[PDB]
Amino acid sequence: ALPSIQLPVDYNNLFNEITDFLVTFKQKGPKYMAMLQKVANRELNSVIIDLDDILQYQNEKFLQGTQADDLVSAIQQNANHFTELFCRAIDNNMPLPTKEIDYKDDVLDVILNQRRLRNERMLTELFPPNLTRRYFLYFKPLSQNCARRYRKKAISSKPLSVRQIKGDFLGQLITVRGIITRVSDVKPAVEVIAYTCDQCGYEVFQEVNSRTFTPLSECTSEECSQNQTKGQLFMSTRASKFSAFQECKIQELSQQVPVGHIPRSLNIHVNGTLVRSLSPGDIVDVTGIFLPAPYTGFKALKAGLLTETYLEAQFVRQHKKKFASFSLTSDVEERVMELITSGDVYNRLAKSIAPEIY
Amino acid sequence: DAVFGDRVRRFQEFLDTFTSYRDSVRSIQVYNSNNAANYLNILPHRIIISLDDLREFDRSFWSGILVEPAYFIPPAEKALTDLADSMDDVPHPNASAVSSRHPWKLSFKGSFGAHALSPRTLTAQHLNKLVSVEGIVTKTSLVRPKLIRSVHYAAKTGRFHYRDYTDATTTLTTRIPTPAIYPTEDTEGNKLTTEYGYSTFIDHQRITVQEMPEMAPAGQLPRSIDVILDDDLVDKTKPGDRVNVVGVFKSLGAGGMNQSNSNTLIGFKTLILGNTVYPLHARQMLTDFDIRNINKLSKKKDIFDILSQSLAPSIYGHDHIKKAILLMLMGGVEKNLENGSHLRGDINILMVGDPSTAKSQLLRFVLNTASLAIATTGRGSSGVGLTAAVTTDRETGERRLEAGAMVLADRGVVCIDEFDKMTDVDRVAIHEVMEQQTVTIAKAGIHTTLNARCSVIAAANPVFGQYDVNRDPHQNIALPDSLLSRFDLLFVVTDDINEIRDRSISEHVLRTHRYLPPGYLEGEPVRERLNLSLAVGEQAGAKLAKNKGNYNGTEIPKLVTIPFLRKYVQYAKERVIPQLTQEAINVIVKNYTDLRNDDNTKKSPITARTLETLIRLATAHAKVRLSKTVNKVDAKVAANLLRFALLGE
DNA sequence: AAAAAAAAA
């Protein structure tokens, strides 16, 4: 069947270390407790985790002979599994709301409360956590000075070009640099899909992560599980959970292209609150996860092992420059005071446009 | 069965006999280890064996490789992998990087004999045999990764599973095909999550190579063959580059032998799995005594005249044209500014004259002697396809740009004949490119700026059959003033009738046609030859065999051979970047002012561009004598050349 | 998407 191999990585100790770091970290008290508290009060909408914090915490705790392994290396070698571990750990230690909440507006929670008041009244289904989650997990790449602080070569970053990325970088966390040319619109995408069951008790749920989805035909309701059908299951748009989806592509800069070559492209997917954070025609450096995508979407029954690849966005620096719409600020106020004190200005401005032409 | 073990141990004995490959493996290991954790280049796990030594050691194994590589190469690479696994010493390895299991695939060099073929010569009886094919790259595909071995994990078991996939084009030996279905369930039903970062992916690219048009049968078109190469060397060379590819030529696919056939007239598919690639270039390196010769010759007072006279010895006259060609092939340095944008760096030459004055021949010589150049004619080209084209890929089904005529000639030189006879519309492409050395394409949803910093040389004949000296220069040339103003130098050539020069050129041309190839009699015509004996090729300073260059004695002044001149220009274009001084500045400004206010008839009007041309020529002449600073003599010679090219002696 | 032939302005 499937032969087995041994790897030096075991996730139990890593999960315990993750919990210890998330509970004990001191940079106000714990930062990671305050942000979770703000999430609980329905104030924050996204979570950012700084790998530099983990690196420095491990480096300073290595002074005592307790730590045995490194976690940022495992993050670099694999990311999505650690995303799942992080969301599980966060949901495990989610704090209590210390503030009032406008509880009537949460239609999803009202619907789930009605479902519970139905099911547990008769003495209930364990809803998956991703349906109940409200936050989003994002990562932040390290900084080169932090790496220079220590002897270890925990570098990452290094904004490779589009063509410099090769096949062995799949699954890691990488940074790319280039110009954005095409940005698509915002379109909602499903995360958890729910079906109404025609008053047959609990409403069956389904979860799909692939880009292709298939619906249900029969349900596990007890009276529907009876020897004759009781109502056809239907998909309910209100109960299901959605997420914003957007895709773009990035072009290599004219500087980095070797002579006699045509610049290449790279697709990129962005989900969550980072949607609409980039515009066509700018120089950026995106950090994210480099993931494969099946070729079966084209459905040609060819390319038995060839597959397409894309990047998943995690953090972006807009870079370039800002016009700012001449927003008023003190510094430019003293600058225009200097200009006023400069006296006649138009001749100087004419002199200052193109000194190259005489 | 045991034949695999016997072959493996025979190859182990062969590797034990020759100690060079072990040294290479140790060097690559220590270099990789040093690159690992010391404050980006990584050497791929590939080694090249010279099968001449293998033939000198064991003829049976050599013949087995050269006849049936399928049953011989895998044991050899297995033995190499085992030797590497025994030699290396890494007591503290990583986790994801230790599972690469790269088989250390090989490369070959040496004499092949009857297996060094051409794309036309490949036939049925050469199948399943290691071969080396020569040709020119015509097109390439995109670099797409493909999967080999996937790693799976289940939370409950804690045991990481792995499944290995192989395709027809992945391995030499045909095995049972495997679909790309991801295993998501264990034998006991445990859920398996695919683990990225531990699986294996390798690059994939397909290229096509065709036989050279020169060595083709009369009245026949060139034919092409396709090459698959992966892992290393995946993005080497480019379209328009002479290559020699060594690999295994094998068939693949059912080819309609199953029920899918619609007619009985079905042929199989043939394809070559490349093992290594080499650049032909009809070599490009320089030795220590080469440097000594270059320096001692550059210390001479008359280097520029010798080099100018060394170009096309069979062309009589046109001395300053040869000098301009020499300055053009190794032109001035490019200047860039954070505020001044871009400054053009090379020089363009245009020639116009009456028929039969040796313009096309000199252009062909420049094409032959240049490091990189592309041949183009005005009538047989279209501007839309001359810069970029949109075509659909057969594999992916998408549409991607194809490089045009001068995009392939980036940082090279483009030679165009019948420039005046080209359609006016296509000229706009030149108007686009020569302006800023950048072509922008925007069509069918593709937006990209392509770099093209090539230099263009053109030759065109005047509107009339023969040049009219008594007429206006503008009305003698069909091209508009806008493009004529860009070209740095305008040269007009006429064959004035003079009995003395007629006699001299007549005896020279008659001397040329009485020539005999060495070692060949005069009674029979020139016959074709085979390739070099080696498929792959490779006391000091006391010989001067091909240094002095005076192969035959006919004049007191010296002459140098072409390959040494190519070596000289290669050295000069890289090792020297000169700077200018105020002494040359004084001469430049003085001669510019004198030329501009002389107020006499001239062939072409001048402007600020001519001074910039003078500066570029001064830089080029500062490069020609291998100096880091510009001397006023360079300014003087540039001024003299310009005055000839604009006034005439 | 790009090359090449034909009738009308």
Ligand SMILES: Nc1ncnc2c1ncn2[C@@H]1O[C@H](COP(=O)(O)OP(=O)(O)OP(=O)(O)O)[C@@H](O)[C@H]1O
């Ligand atoms: N100075 C010369 N020395 C030797 N051969 C010469 C010289 N001038 C002309 N010829 C000869 O003139 C012939 C004409 O060649 P070619 O057509 O290339 O010349 P061209 O001047 O470029 O002509 P065109 O304008 O018709 O293209 C060639 O065979 C060449 O050898």
Ligand SMILES: [Mg+2]
């Ligand atoms: Mg000619």
Ligand SMILES: [Zn+2]
């Ligand atoms: Zn029902």
